[PDB]
Amino acid sequence: MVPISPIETVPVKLKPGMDGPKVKQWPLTEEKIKALVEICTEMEKEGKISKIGPENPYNTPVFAIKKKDSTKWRKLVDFRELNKRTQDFWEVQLGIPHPAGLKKKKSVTVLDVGDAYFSVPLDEDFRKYTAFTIPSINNETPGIRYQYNVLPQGWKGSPAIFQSSMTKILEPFAAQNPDIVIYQYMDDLYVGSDLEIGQHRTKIEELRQHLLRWGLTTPDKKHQKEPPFLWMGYELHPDKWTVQPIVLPEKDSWTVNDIQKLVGKLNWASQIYPGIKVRQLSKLLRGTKALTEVIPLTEEAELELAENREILKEPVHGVYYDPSKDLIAEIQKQGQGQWTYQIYQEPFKNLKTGKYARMRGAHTNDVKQLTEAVQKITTESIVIWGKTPKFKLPIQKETWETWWTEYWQATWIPEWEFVNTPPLVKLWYQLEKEPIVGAETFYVDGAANRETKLGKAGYVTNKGRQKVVPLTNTTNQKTELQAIYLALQDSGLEVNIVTDSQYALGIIQAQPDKSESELVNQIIEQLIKKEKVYLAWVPAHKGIGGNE
Amino acid sequence: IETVPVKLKPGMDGPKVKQWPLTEEKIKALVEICTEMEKEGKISKIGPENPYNTPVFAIKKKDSTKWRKLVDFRELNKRTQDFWEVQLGIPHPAGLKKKKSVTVLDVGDAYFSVPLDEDFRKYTAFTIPSINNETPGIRYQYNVLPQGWKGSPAIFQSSMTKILEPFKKQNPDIVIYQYMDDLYVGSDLEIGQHRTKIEELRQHLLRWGLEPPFLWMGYELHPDKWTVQPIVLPEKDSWTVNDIQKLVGKLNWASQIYPGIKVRQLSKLLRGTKALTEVIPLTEEAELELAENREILKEPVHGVYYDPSKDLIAEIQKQGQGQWTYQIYQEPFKNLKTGKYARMRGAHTNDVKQLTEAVQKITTESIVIWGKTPKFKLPIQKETWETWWTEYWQATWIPEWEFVNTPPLVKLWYQ
Ligand SMILES: Cc1cc(/C=C/C#N)cc(C)c1Nc1ccnc(Nc2ccc(C#N)cc2)n1
Ligand SMILES: [Br-]
Ligand SMILES: [Br-]
Ligand SMILES: [Br-]
Incomplete structure (x- = not known):
């Protein structure tokens, strides 16, 4: 007999x-x-x-x-x-x-190693x-x-x-044959290369001989499976890939479970089908987990679905990775906190696509979201290709510089270039660094009774202008914002505002352009209409006139 | 063995x-x-x-x-x-923090000469x-x-200790301190002489070995020159309403750190409803209060002590134009050290690189002074930091950190 190496x-x-x-x-x-x-x-x-x-x-x-x-x-x-x-x-x-992240291969062979799957010795003890x-x-x-x-x-x-x-068995073979790739899936070995078919099939036979050292036989009658390969929800071809067929059903009414299944398919599809959206469809799943419950689709959910059906009407394929070429990542704003991107090396030939969704939170702005999406794509790219792609972003260079230089946090985006495809990300307002000469000064304040939740908001100005509004169903924090809102409403295009609200300062210094609070949203829309706004903070209850 | x-x-x-x-x-x-x-x-x-x-x-x-x-x-x-x-x-x-020059050596390679417990x-x-x-x-x-x-x-x-015994004997005024892979060697010698003692050490180090890839390197510090940041108030001939508001705000904040801070008389200047840019004359009462506050701020904070049983906490603020302020404390308002950086090591367009360098420099100061690293509160979103900090990291240790998502008002007062 021929001695075999023990495992x-x-x-x-x-x-x-x-x-x-x-x-x-x-x-x-x-x-x-x-x-x-x-x-x-x-x-x-x-x-x-x-x-x-x-x-x-x-x-x-x-x-x-x-x-x-x-x-x-x-x-x-x-x-x-x-x-x-x-x-x-x-x-x-x-x-x-x-x-x-895979590379294109001229040949990919399958070897059956099923009679190895069941022959690994178990620790004696x-x-x-x-x-x-x-x-x-x-x-x-x-x-x-x-x-x-x-x-x-x-x-x-x-x-x-x-x-x-x-792995232990295959390591030396892969190491001494750098012109092939080897991958194991279940009880099959996949061997790819760019070699001339002859040299390639020699490699296959050499691998067969190598495996024999451990007494591992592979069927002479070669595998039935051949490209394209169905693998982990994908279709792999020699020079391209896609996701397996995505079929969105026709349905008169949708169940929780059905919607979960819809979102899943859409999420899966989104990695090569550009522009897939799931915001409105995911919104239907909010808070409730009765898998049998039927939910009426909103008119917004219906459009989103229709948009998706259109995107999915015919097949899309991605190409494989060419290490000798740069990676390019392009991002678009889709609205409602949704972002979509494509990663490519050659124009009109995506390696893959994807999406990013706004994180839940009280306040936000497009620039923060864009920044987050960049970090997500960067991280995904390190995983898949081991390097950062160059970015094409719908934000002007000047806009970015104004943002990060003035933002209270450290922030950064890797090498990128402006791509002029609307809608563009911009700064909707910018507060003054110094008080405005000639602009009316509004001293604002608000307060509420914690028990009866009745309150007041108002201002006094250097020009004698004054206002106080009585409010119901409110809070100190809310009245503080309402007071700022009133000053913005009643002032000209340039205004100085003085508040003692640390709460309001915290929000505004975060530079939101959109909020879950309709009051903040109203303040934002007022800020956008101004030419100049200087916001000043003072401590409360210290005898500060105007504010007193 | x-x-x-x-x-x-x-x-x-x-x-x-x-x-x-x-x-x-x-x-x-x-x-x-x-x-x-x-x-x-x-x-x-x-x-x-x-x-x-x-x-x-x-x-x-x-x-x-x-x-x-x-x-x-x-x-x-x-x-x-x-x-x-x-x-x-x-x-x-x-005594380490009091030397004129401290060189940091990477001696981590020495560790590889000792076997690790099999279990x-x-x-x-x-x-x-x-x-x-x-x-x-x-x-x-x-x-x-x-x-x-x-x-x-x-x-x-x-x-x-055995390796360092002869060098210590021959150089009794040299302070040698080890933290993790780092060796800190401090002396009051002329830098030329200092660099010659450092090289002397490297030799005594090599001798034991018989080559270390990073031992030849030397990172020079000068802790006796390390600066602090007392609370200072502006000196002005003309105060606007806005100036005075900022002064009262800063004093209000300072009064949490310093007991006898008063703003009564200065606040009384803000009586009325004047334009922010209007100049306000200081009253005698206000000037005196301001003067008395200045004096208070010349004193150290009371009841400030280091406790080795407690964590050190480090906070950092982005001040813009490549400037960064930071505080190290164990208890709020009881700062053990404060400082400010401006110098840029080729990061004029990269906030995150600057912050990463600040973290490392603050950590180094902490090691020298107390012999341990602080827990950082970083003014940066988690995802941004986690994605990039390893690209700019040059130290062989790594501190703990958490993330600040809400802008501090105190940024203004450390400016
Ligand atoms: C991960 C992987 C899965 C399968 C197979 C899984 C299954 N079923 C087959 C192979 C050979 C690999 N490994 C690698 C490594 C580098 N490039 C490639 N490119 C590549 C792979 C398959 C096809 C095809 N057709 C084309 C190119 N594959
Ligand atoms: Br079996
Ligand atoms: Br599928
Ligand atoms: Br680019």
Whole structure:
């Protein structure tokens, strides 16, 4: 015989303080028992399991399930209990590759390694914990006891140990053959290259010979699967990729569950279909989680859906990554806190697309949102391509400089250029750094009674102008904003405003252009109409005239 | 040669921290570094039965072209037992901050000469990721004392003392202080002479070794020149209503720090409803109150003391035009240090680079003065900071931080 290299077993432990499983075997029909006896006799012959004595105190239940439309049974060990007691492992996965990060390949071959999947040896010291029992006929004799010698299907550690064992095998081959790529998915190996078909198929045979060192045979009759590949919700082709078919159903009425399913498909589609939107459709899911409940679609939700159907009317494909070319990322504002982007290297050929949604919060502005989207795309790009794309942004260079130089926080955006495609992000107002000479000075104030929630807002100015408005159902904070609003309403195009409201200062210094508070929104619209606004803060209750 | 037993804290498992995304160039750098480290026996490949992880990346130290591996052991360090068995602790030298020149040496490489407790190694697991997860991440653990781990200086302490004994004997006025991978060497010598003593040390250091990649480097500080920021009020001949309002505001704020601050008489100037730009004459009562406040602000804050049992907190404000102010305290209004930066190291168009440099400089000052790092309150959105700070980081330690999302009014008063 030809000696084969043994596969190092991974040492496995149970979680601290925990013992192995001791679970009652379920009774089985005489039919099922016979089926399991034969299966296990065969598995034992192959060395996958071994009979054990009565000394082993552990047990995991075994079942026989009727393979549909057939007379052949299948063996299923329910390792749920053992898995609870088995240590955590390192997910060798680390994440799934994104197709947009893959490189184009002239050839991709599939090798079946199914007869490896079930041949990884199990740590000798852990095998006892995998014990199971075939019940005896009529329960008149001891059940036949077996334990595993290899990684069992359904056991917590099998995927991780399998992947690590196959990686260990493939490492030297990949390392010494840098002109190919190798990827494992389930019980198949995928081998891609740009080599001349001849050189390529030689590589395949060399890999077959390499795998033989560990006694691993691969079927001569080559795989049935061939490009395009259906993989993790994608379609992979030699020189392009897309998502698998997205079909939005026709429906007269929509259920919570249906809407969740709609959003999911739209979210999935959004990574290559430009401009997908889900704001209005997601809004229908707000707060409620009765999966059977029917929700009427708003007129806004209907349009969004119609817009999506149009985007999805015909197939779109992305290209693969060319490391010798720059990555470009372009962003558009869509409205209602929605942003969409495309990443490409060649014009009119996207690697991928995507979207970003405004974070929930009291106040916000387009520039902050644009900034956040940039950081998201940057991070996604590091993951997929290992580098930051150059950005094309719908914001003028001058606008950006005014923003970040004057903003109270540190902020930054990597190398980018202005793209003049409306709607453009702009600054809607900018407060003065110094008090305005010649502009009327409004001293504003407000207060409310916490119990009766009645209040007042008003101002006095250096020109004798005055106003006080009585208010109902209000708060100190609200009256403070209302007072500022009144000063803005009743002043000319240039105005100095003096407030003692730390609350109002905090909001305005955040430079919102849109708010959840309609009062703030009213203030914003007033600010936009002004030529000059200087806001001054003073401490309350210190004898400050005007404000007093 | 024999390992010191090390354990985690009671009822506490190892770190399971996600590796954050790394650029192509950092991955390639780390693959190169770790390949060599593996050949040298410093690290070994690990299996899937090790579920722990600590993030790793790479930096380029100040004034160098070679990559340095940097592990973010912040989580492991929190979970690692405290080390007081041999010594209750290394009383921090109060003299270090008083030297005219302090050079910082990277001696982290020395740690690799000591083996790490066989049972603890698994907790030092880290991952080199692949771009787009196309190949399996490379998994390693340490066989020796890792750089950045709090246990390394603790375990190596006895060895370092022996190494430094002869140099200390020959140079009794030199202050040597170690923090993590850094060695701080302070003297009152002429810089030329100082740099010659530093080089003297490097030699005495090398001698023991028999080469260290970053030992040759030297980062010079001058803590005796480090400046503070007392509260000062404007001196003016003409006060507008606005000027006076700002003065009263600042004094109101100062009165939380200083007891006898009064604004009664000055506030009385703001009696009435005048244009913001109108000049107001100061009354005699107001001038006296202002004068008395000036005097108060010339004094130190009362009841200010450092407590080693409490966290140091650092706040930073962006003042614009590349200027930054900061305060270090343990209790509100009880500042232990305040300062201001202006100098720009090629970051005139990048706020985040500036902030990152400020953080590192503040951390350095804190180490020199109290021998530990502060927890930062950063005026920046989380996502922006997390995306970029590693691009500008040049230190071998990493402090803790949190994020300020609400603009402080106090920014005005530290201007
Ligand atoms: C992740 C991955 C999944 C599959 C297969 C998964 C499945 N099912 C096959 C391979 C070879 C890979 N690995 C890599 C690595 C770098 N570039 C590529 N490019 C690439 C891959 C497939 C096709 C096609 N058709 C074209 C180009 N693939
Ligand atoms: Br099997
Ligand atoms: Br799909
Ligand atoms: Br660009």
